[PDB]
RNA sequence: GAUGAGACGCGUUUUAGAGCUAGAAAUAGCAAGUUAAAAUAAGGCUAGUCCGUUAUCAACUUGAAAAAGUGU
């Protein structure tokens, strides 16, 4: 008949149930398909679907853009050879040929194996005049004599294979890439990002200090000496400890809790640096920036010594002379060594196994570890000066290519290149021709609008093409389209506005956003001066007057230049106050200072008709970061500005993407105000209303503007649906899965689609490491409320931040050791006595968090009110709770709840307001969710334009079924089993048809689509619960889940009764029995078959581990190359099984080669799985197998379940592991009594009832010894680790006089051996388990396959004994 | 809150850099090392200075494929 859905989705998981009309789940009989005597099973309408989580593209997208380097880099040395092919023709026939097959062994090269000439004596005579290419590179740049053309083509193919970075624009120059100018626009940036207490630094030589052969912490303090205002600790002192390549933490700096490290060698830097950046602000950005440009000048300058005389090629020559001087040092050390130090001689030189010198040279050992290894030595021998002081300055022994490399300019390499082609232009003619186009392969790169230079069949490319030919870095510029492609690529770059589809989002550094944002700090701001006595929120004349003042005369803005140059001098206020902001406006006017400081015109900036101007030239700057198509995209506004101006804007970058569009800011309008967003932040009367505000309130058109705007026009796919969603690929994978799971269901119930589907999105339990955090938050808020108000509690009442995670105790801090209802002093160990109240009783809204809690001796002192405490506390306590607000103890909202008597009570809105923080759902991505089910739900229509909804989708809270858990003792713990999943999704249906039946006209706040809004009178009754079935007032209490209780106590202790059976007013219809109903609850979970399902999935990614291992005899390796024997170059091991499969056949076995049939569990690996899948039967042909049957060749992915004797489970892991496929089903009295065993101190309730928890946890202690018996016997029967048990029940036999709850909790940890899936090691009091691993798979050969359907009520089970 | 475009430098693996002197070998004494080429998922056809580690995937039937169907 009629039924309902229940979803629970998550990450790894998604629960699903379907009740009935009266709440209970239907059993149906399912047809079972395969080769089974089986052909009908009886299963529960419940169940959960367990996957794997979804992975992001991040490594893909890395290893894609590695390819495309490489391959790009050797189109490259192709162009370079194709250049020289001709003219080599003449010099020698097989250079090329003889470069080619350098890689391969003299036995598979036809050639000769010397490389370069081909014959031994010039090799090495070459080798012996170069021993570094860098050798011929500095005699190629200087020499006038006649060169060799291969070894012109070695330096030329040299400098284009690693050409160099491209971080620096245009020319060379000493303003962009010597250490003292950018250390001065470092200096400017941290003086511009300040401008109070500013550090000038114009006497320094910033050079002969930072570029100095030094140590660098002693390089460091030496730059540290010249500034006496600056510490080595300090922020700038941490920057340049940045820049000069150590690792400066800047936790201190921001009294962050977290530690914060930061290394620009270190591979994990950017992400760390994002990170800070999202803490701090990225105002810093550009600061960091700085400071790695600098260290880049020095690593650059470090490198470059050679700058004598300045003659040459000074890279080549700075490397030569590298390698000179590591010849003296080595040298010297080995007769340093060997006079002083015989033993242990081969070590060093020989052994290379343990980081030596030859483990330097020879062996995997970086320069470091090689300084880390030879400096004891060196400070165990004498004369050892020199050496040392080279090797704190990292320049001993060092190698010329090395990872300091990464701040070497192309434009280095382009001067020697084009320095080498004009020596040898003269004697060759075609160099001379073709200089152009070598420069030109060296200089190319493609620009990040035009991407892949593809012909429609990428993915990922967009560009266009002005001509049918293929694109060289030559005719690059007259062959691509660069307009239509950089159009094509801002369409593709522009996301849009999550709030409003079809508008593009502005740029983060866009003026109208900075307006926007500045306004919108700045319209929740209150100002109360001596006189008015109460806070008055800022006018619109004021807030102008404000901005064009100070905003748009400084970057920053704080309080104190806010009233002294403002509210003293222009309203002329001697004292005034401020609660809005904290020190200074986190806002700021970038933007405009910067094109201020550009163009030098500040009415220009003022004039509201160039706001689309000054728009589109931040777009440009945003978009593109290459310099031609800025100017082309800013030539139109050449008549505007000229010169160094032009230059100097040309010059700007702005990087990063907002939220909002210009549309949302100021475009949809009110249609009663005639008001935009922006205006409303500018000016709105008395009350001053925010963004946020303005989207939430519906007494404006914007909600019902930006809702009916949201569906797209026409309908596309679902996985477009779901990829424009705003989550995690996991969550999305999640969301697509609990679509297939309602399209299944709604198959089984004959097509028949339900009345309702409530969703919720499950919560991601606490990590733990949270779990650290809020007690470091809790403990600082402590000591910075106890130094503020000035009582030395932490003196007589020490506490550490692991105490501080009690309710009671943190109260009692937070609370001065003072009742907050009474001028008396709390009993520090007498705290058992004291009870916590809410200052917001339970019958009104549903918050036990420390934002609505207190510590008192009574409740009775909160007075007689059924309300918020009484107003003759409040008066006597206003003094002390102000105390505790300025002193941050407690927040605003706790201070306004408290003091709520003093302004008549509680309210109609605040009524209102609890219900919709009750009732109402924040989360986007669930509201997108249930757009999608409905839109997949609902299709039909009528004889008007009118959506017809046969469906309803419901949206809950995870906080109403987790109380509904709580409050009824349907208590949850998930270690059990995965069946907490579908439980929470039958819950979740309840409690949704519950709500929907119980108040039908607050179908606005959960069910998704366009219904009637409703208003708060008509919801919420005057005062009392007067007339009972004669009003139209659904609740008097603003609590939803009161119509579940039997009794409602309030904050007096009044016990108000609510009827047996609860029902609706308007309609007449039953919407709770709270005996049979809950007796229905019960007894559902209390089900013993759950339909637990885990995805099976082919494995997919990367064909093996990427060390690439030396060669060996071993044939297990596989080969880099088809051709390349890994025997003789070696190759990759440990290859990764995409998925397994049976298959049977006969095998050839013994000396008379006699077939024997056989059946076999064969692992296909992912390199392997196209050959298998294009041909079967060849391929295990190939393998070894002998007449294969095609029909019988199985598939079987990971996790695939199989069934053995006595109902026990196996899944299929890998081709030689397998994992544990049984769910332990306990009786719900179990998990009720181990939940309030281990919850036995933190009840966190009421004392009556508290204590009968405990009683009941006393009374029933055979249940310990019940639950072992249970785990036991589940055990012998499916687990069969014999061992484990054992050793667990000895255990637990040593161990039974110990108290119920750690017992307990034991328990819990215990069932980790009985849990589905892998095998893990786990604790059980002293006792540490490890796990007993299935490395034996051969038993599945004959046990039954279980193939599952999504929801597993559809079983194929295919006995696989009857299969040979 | 996901998805994308450009580029650098290491790393690793083979080969090229002739090891020299004794001793029947076994094994001993030293001389030196810094660089380069090439590969960097095997590969694919659509042959692009493109694509190849994300997403997606029970079984069976029908389809080249998107996708439809099959079980009170």
Redesign the pocket.
Request: charged share 30%; glycine share 6%.
């Given at each position: 008949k009629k039924y309902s859905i229940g979803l629970d989705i998550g990450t790894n998981s998604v629960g699903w149930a379907v009740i009935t009309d009266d709440y209970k789940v239907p059993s149906?009989?399912?047809?079972?398909?395969?080769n089974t005597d089986r052909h009908?099973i009886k299963k529960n309408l419940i169940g959960a679907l367990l996957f794997?989580?979804?992975?992001?593209?991040?490594?893909?997208?890395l290893?894609?853009?590695?390819?495309?380097?490489?391959?790009?880099?050797?189109?490259?040395?192709c162009?370079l050879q194709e250049i020289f092919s001709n003219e080599m023709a003449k010099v020698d026939d097989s250079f090329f040929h003889r470069?080619?097959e350098?890689?391969?062994?003299?036995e598979d090269?036809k050639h000769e194996?010397?490389?370069?000439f081909g014959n031994?004596?010039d090799?090495?005579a070459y080798?012996?005049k170069?021993?570094?290419?860098?050798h011929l590179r500095k005699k190629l740049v200087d020499s006038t004599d006649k060169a060799d053309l291969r070894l012109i083509y070695?330096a030329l193919?040299?400098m284009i294979?690693?050409?160099?970075?491209?971080?620096i624009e245009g020319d060379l120059n000493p303003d962009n890439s010597d250490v003292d100018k950018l250390f001065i626009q470092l200096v400017q940036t941290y003086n511009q990002l300040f401008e109070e207490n500013p550090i000038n630094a114009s006497g320094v030589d910033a050079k002969a200090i930072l570029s100095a052969r030094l140590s660098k912490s002693r390089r460091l303090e030496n730059l540290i000496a010249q500034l006496p205002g600056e510490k080595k600790n300090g922020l700038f002192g941490n920057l340049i400890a940045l820049s000069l390549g150590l690792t400066p933490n800047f936790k201190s700096n921001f009294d962050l809790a977290e530690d914060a490290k930061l290394q620009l060698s270190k591979?994990t830097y950017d992400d760390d640096l994002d990170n800070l950046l999202a803490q701090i602000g990225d105002q810093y950005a550009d600061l960091f920036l700085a400071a790695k440009n600098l260290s880049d000048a020095i690593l650059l300058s470090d490198i470059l010594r050679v700058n004598t005389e300045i003659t040459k090629a000074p890279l080549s020559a700075s490397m030569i002379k590298?390698?000179?001087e590591?010849?003296q040092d080595?040298?010297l050390l080995?007769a340093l060594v060997?006079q002083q130090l015989?033993e242990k001689?081969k070590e060093i030189?020989?052994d290379?196994s343990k980081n030596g010198?030859?483990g330097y040279?020879?062996?995997?050992?970086?320069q470091e570890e090689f300084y880390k290894f030879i400096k004891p030595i060196l400070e165990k021998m004498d004369g050892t000066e020199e050496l040392l002081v080279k090797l704190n300055r990292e320049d001993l022994?060092?190698?010329?290519?090395?990872?300091?490399?990464?701040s070497?300019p192309?434009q280095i390499h382009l001067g020697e290149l084009h320095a080498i082609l004009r020596r040898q232009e003269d004697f060759y003619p075609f160099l001379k021709d073709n200089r152009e186009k070598i420069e030109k392969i060296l200089t190319?790169?493609?620009?990040?609008?035009?991407?892949?230079?593809?012909?429609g069949?990428?993915?990922?490319?967009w560009m266009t093409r002005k001509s049918e030919?293929?694109?060289?870095?030559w005719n690059?510029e007259e062959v691509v389209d660069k307009g239509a492609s950089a159009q094509s690529?801002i369409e593709?770059?522009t996301?849009?506005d999550?709030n409003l589809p079809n508008e593009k989002?502005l740029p983060k550094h866009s003026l109208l956003y900075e307006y926007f944002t500045v306004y919108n700090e700045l319209t929740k701001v209150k100002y109360v001066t001596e006189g008015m006595r109460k806070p008055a929120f800022l006018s619109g004349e004021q807030k102008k007057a404000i901005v064009d003042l100070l905003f748009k005369t400084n970057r920053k803005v704080t309080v104190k230049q806010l009233k002294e140059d403002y509210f003293k001098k222009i309203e002329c206020f001697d004292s005034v106050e401020i609660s809005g902001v904290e020190d200074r406006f986190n806002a700021s006017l970038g933007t405009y200072h910067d094109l201020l400081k550009i163009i030098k015109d500040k009415d220009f900036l003022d004039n509201e008709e160039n706001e689309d101007i000054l728009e589109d030239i931040v777009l440009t700057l945003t978009l593109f970061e290459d310099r031609e198509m800025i100017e082309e995209r800013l030539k139109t506004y050449a008549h505007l500005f000229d010169d160094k101006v032009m230059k100097q804007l040309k010059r700007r970058r702005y990087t990063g993407?907002g939220?909002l569009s210009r549309k949302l800011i100021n475009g949809i309008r009110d249609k009663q105000s005639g008001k935009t967003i922006l205006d409303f932040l500018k000016s709105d009367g008395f009350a001053n209303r925010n963004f946020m505000q303005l989207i939430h309130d519906d007494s404006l058109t914007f909600k019902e503007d930006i809702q009916k705007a949201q569906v797209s026009g026409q309908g596309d796919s679902l996985?477009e649906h779901?990829?424009?969603?705003?989550?995690?690929?996991?969550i999305?994978?999640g969301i697509?899965?609990t679509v297939?799971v309602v399209d299944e269901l709604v198959?089984?119930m004959?097509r028949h689609k339900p009345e309702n589907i409530v969703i919720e999105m499950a919560r991601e339990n606490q990590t733990t490491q949270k779990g650290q955090k809020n007690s470091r938050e809790r403990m600082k808020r402590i000591e910075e409320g106890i130094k503020e108000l000035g009582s030395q509690i932490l003196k007589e009442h020490p506490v550490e931040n692991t105490q501080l995670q009690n309710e009671k105790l943190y109260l009692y801090y937070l609370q001065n050791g003072r009742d907050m209802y009474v001028d008396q002093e709390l009993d520090i160990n007498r705290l058992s006595d004291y009870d916590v109240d809410h200052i917001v009783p339970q019958s009104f809204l549903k918050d036990d968090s420390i934002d609505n809690k207190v510590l008192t001796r009574s409740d009775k002192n909160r007075g007689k009110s059924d309300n918020v405490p009484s107003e003759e506390v409040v008066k006597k306590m206003k003094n002390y709770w102000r105390q505790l607000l300025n002193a941050k103890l407690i927040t605003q909202r706790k201070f306004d709840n408290l003091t709520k008597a003093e302004r008549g009570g509680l309210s109609e809105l605040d009524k209102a307001g609890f219900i919709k923080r009750q009732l109402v759902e924040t989360r986007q991505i669930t509201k997108h969710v249930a757009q999608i089910l409905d839109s997949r739900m609902n299709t039909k229509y009528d004889e008007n334009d009118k959506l017809i909804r046969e469906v309803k989708v419901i949206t809950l809270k995870s906080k109403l079924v987790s109380d509904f858990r709580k409050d009824f003792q349907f208590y949850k713990v998930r270690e059990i089993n995965n069946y907490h999943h579908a439980h929470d999704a039958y819950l979740n249906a309840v409690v949704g048809t519950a709500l929907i039946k119980k108040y039908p006209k607050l179908e606005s706040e959960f069910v998704y689509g366009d219904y009637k809004v409703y208003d708060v009178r008509k919801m919420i009754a005057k005062s009392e619960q007067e007339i009972g079935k004669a009003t139209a007032k659904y609740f008097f209490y603003s609590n939803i889940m009161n119509f579940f209780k039997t009794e409602i106590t309030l904050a007096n202790g009044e016990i108000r009764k609510r009827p047996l059976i609860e029902t609706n007013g308007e309609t007449g219809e039953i919407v709770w029995d709270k005996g049979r109903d809950f007796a229905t609850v019960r007894k559902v979970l209390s089900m013993p078959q759950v339909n637990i399902v885990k995805?099976?999935?082919?494995?997919?990614?990367?064909?093996?581990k990427?060390?690439?291992?030396?060669?060996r005899n071993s044939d297990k390796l596989?080969?880099?190359?088809?051709?390349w024997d890994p025997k003789?170059?070696?190759?990759?091991d440990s290859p990764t099984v995409a998925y397994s499969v049976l298959v049977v056949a006969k095998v050839e076995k013994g000396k008379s080669k006699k077939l024997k049939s056989v059946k076999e569990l064969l692992g296909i690996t992912?390199?392997?799985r196209?050959?298998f899948e294009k041909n079967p039967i060849d391929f295990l042909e190939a393998k070894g197998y002998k007449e294969v049957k095609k029909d019988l060749i199985?598939?079987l992915?990971k996790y695939?379940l199989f069934e053995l004797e006595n109902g026990r489970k196996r899944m299929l892991a890998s081709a030689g592991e397998l994992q544990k496929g049984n769910e332990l089903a306990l009786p719900s009295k179990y998990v009720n009594f181990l939940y309030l065993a281990s919850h036995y101190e933190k009840l966190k309730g009421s004392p009556e009832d508290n204590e009968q928890k405990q009683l009941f946890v006393e009374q029933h202690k055979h249940y310990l010894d019940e639950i072992i018996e249970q785990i036991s016997e589940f055990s012998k029967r499916v687990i069969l680790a014999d061992a484990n048990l054992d050793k667990v029940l000895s255990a637990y036999n040593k161990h039974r006089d110990k108290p119920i709850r750690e017992q307990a909790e034991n328990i819990i940890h215990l069932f980790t051996l009985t849990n589905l899936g892998a095998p893990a090691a786990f604790k059980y009091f002293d006792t540490t388990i490890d796990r007993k691993r299935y490395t034996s798979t051969k038993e599945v050969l004959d046990a039954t396959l279980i193939?599952?359907?999504?929801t597993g009520l559809?079983?194929?089970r295919?006995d696989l004994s009857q299969l040979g």
């Open positions: 149906k009989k399912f047809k079972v398909l395969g009908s794997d989580s979804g992975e992001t593209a991040e490594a893909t997208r290893k894609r853009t590695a390819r495309r380097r490489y391959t790009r880099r050797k189109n490259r040395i162009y470069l080619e350098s890689f391969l062994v003299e090269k194996r010397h490389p370069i031994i004596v090799e090495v080798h012996e170069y021993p570094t290419i860098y070695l193919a040299h294979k690693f050409r160099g970075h491209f971080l591979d590298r390698y000179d590591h010849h080595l040298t080995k060997r015989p001689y030189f020989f290379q010198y030859a040279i020879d062996g995997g050992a970086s022994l060092r190698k010329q290519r090395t990872f300091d490399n990464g070497i192309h190319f790169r493609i620009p990040y609008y035009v991407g892949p230079l593809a012909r069949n990428s993915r990922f490319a030919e293929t694109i060289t870095p690059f690529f593709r770059m996301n849009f999550k989002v993407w939220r996985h779901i990829a424009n969603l705003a989550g995690s690929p996991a999305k994978k697509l899965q297939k198959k089984v004959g995805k099976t999935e082919v494995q997919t990614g990367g064909f093996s990427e060390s690439i291992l030396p060669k596989i080969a880099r190359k088809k051709d003789k170059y070696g190759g990759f992912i390199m392997e196209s050959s199985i598939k992915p695939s193939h599952q359907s999504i559809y079983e194929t295919i």
